[PDB]
């Protein structure tokens, strides 16, 4: 199916409609088509908890092994080999420590994400914090925040962390190419994208298979953006200037009409237009920023160069992608600013400003924030700053220098 | 349930009534109650077989890992911890070699049995034979023969190898205590046991759960025997004399009326009476010899000593059984002959004679033959002799001296 991702929550019982065995069947079905899953194990009771009629429960870390085996077998046998599994878990779970410290031999083919917020982080003991920092520094444990819908009932993130869905949901995404649109066309492009997304929401028919929710009950769609670096290059605006202009616009402070200010105002106007169009069709959540590693390569800017993925600056001007089918393809991002030159502060400020702009309308799913391992030093201060900032995830740990 | 064992055969398809996923659910259900399973993987296509719509199949050895994980988790969490899994496989399967050589790290918590006969053994290449001999010498691979019902449709052995059942079947067993019955009472005891088994066959209601076959369609029961060594001791008959008498009786040759001959004639008469009673109730198969390690300890002979398990001679006169609940219990088998003193030949001849007597009526399931590793040298000649002899399995590799 076109469904890129799906979300499943497993109840604390072996059998049922959403039982662990039903979880095995659903994961097998999702992997046989290539779509990834995010099996949330936050409800399984802790390991060693005795009920009285002796059933010494094993805990989520035990079933992680079953999911790992299923993933390995089916992905190596599956038609689509791009599927992945992400076994989310909470930070308040008493088992989290074990979940953090399991070596790659025990759980070889499953990524791991931790749902954290202010309360659980504060309550966590120092040992758990140190284990989390060590894990993230080695690139094993991802982070994600917790957000409740307007009714207060919990919603859960997907595989790639920027879309928030309920149980057995699905994800519909569409990307707007900033590099390929002129400054005046931004609002029109945003309106066209949002209208197309609203129209396409009701014609997917994903839920007909009986595994997914019906389309009428979802009321969600994600309008992401890609190709910011090319736009900044074309207008001759550096990341520092764009970040300062975005911060000034968001704070409401007066600012001179520099090109960065014009771009920021155009982005705000387009976001507002898209928000109005979505509100017309009764869309709960509209804006979601997802990585475009597999989608950016098929688009081009005005000058003919390849558009940079999402809004971050490309690590290197030229990228050589190796695929077993089409071989090795060497593409160029043009004379754009790259990670080492811009610096950590400019990138962080720019992403924070854009995420604040998108969130201002209240229709934000999330963002798949990266992290440059060769520049910043992982510390509890870094996690505190990440939690304080409007970001909503921590995806990968790259090397830039 | 009282069901000691069950048999499942998995088809070559992911979904269905007997699909691999149905196999996972059935194995989980069987393990949650302690009853073991014998998941026959002889129908899964070989690893690496391509169909054209790319599905590079993994093979049975891959799903052995899923079954191992399920067994580990559920047995350590299961209420009854006596459950076990035995992943049968054929000798003609092109994957058998891998199945034989997998180390204990890959498949830690699943036993392995090989279904062999004359044709497959002859067709097997030397490397497979050497791998099988090495495996059996280390006590990893068990053997079992192939037998077809009166209609020619294949039937499959259970976990402990002496009962032959169809898919989703069950096993009903009852044991006759030779040590606790006088020489004249043998026929009456056999008749009583067979009548009780026939009566109890139709009142188990195992198939009401929807997983097992209905009781009306089974038409099977197993009348085993235990406590031969005590009987031989009481009558003052050594294993050699009893074996010679049994061989003479079976061959039809004239023989003097020695005590061994009297015992053999009584056994034959009792077997014939039980066979007639079973045939009265239309029983397809009636006689099955199973190990009594967990059942012999609750019975006593005429002199008050504990009866020896099945028909083999006990390894040591005194046995100290350690259980976490009742602690350590030291029981005595009395002044009975033991393994080293009797020798391999006498034991082999006695078991062969008794199995021939039981098979003479055509109502034999099988026998769980042991093997003394410290006496016999494993060679292709040994396997040839085992195949030639009326035995039907090869269970464990013990040490006697
Ligand atoms: C039976 C069993 C349960 N468990 C644990 C893990 C599951 O999350 C949890 C679900 O057990 P349940 O299936 O709900 O056990 P139960 O219904 O018989 O008893 P109760 O209602 O009190 O739970 O039990 C094991 O880990 N291993 C086992 O073998
Ligand atoms: C899809 C898939 C199949 N297989 C192998 C193992 C199973 O024994 C076997 C069953 O596949 P099927 O489910 O029968 O595949 P199919 O129905 O789409 O195509 P066909 O009818 O030709 O089989 O395929 C894998 O090993 N891994 C996989 O991911």
Numbering used by the authors:
A (entry chain B), B (entry chain A): 26 to 426
Q: What does the primary publication say about this deposited structure?
A:
RNRs are used by all free-living organisms and many viruses for the conversion of ribonucleotides to 2ʹ-deoxyribonucleotides in the de novo biosynthesis of DNA precursors. RNRs are especially fascinating from an evolutionary perspective as they exhibit high diversity in primary sequence and cofactor requirement, yet they share a common fold and radical-based catalytic mechanism for nucleotide reduction.
To examine the structural features of the class Ø RNR, we used a combination of AlphaFold2, SAXS, and cryo-EM to characterize the Synechococcus phage S-CBP4 α subunit. Addition of substrate (guanosine diphosphate [GDP]) does not shift this equilibrium, but the presence of the corresponding specificity effector (thymidine triphosphate [TTP]), strongly favors dimerization. Finally, we observe a disulfide between active-site cysteines (C30 and C196) that in class I and II RNRs serve as reducing equivalents during nucleotide reduction.
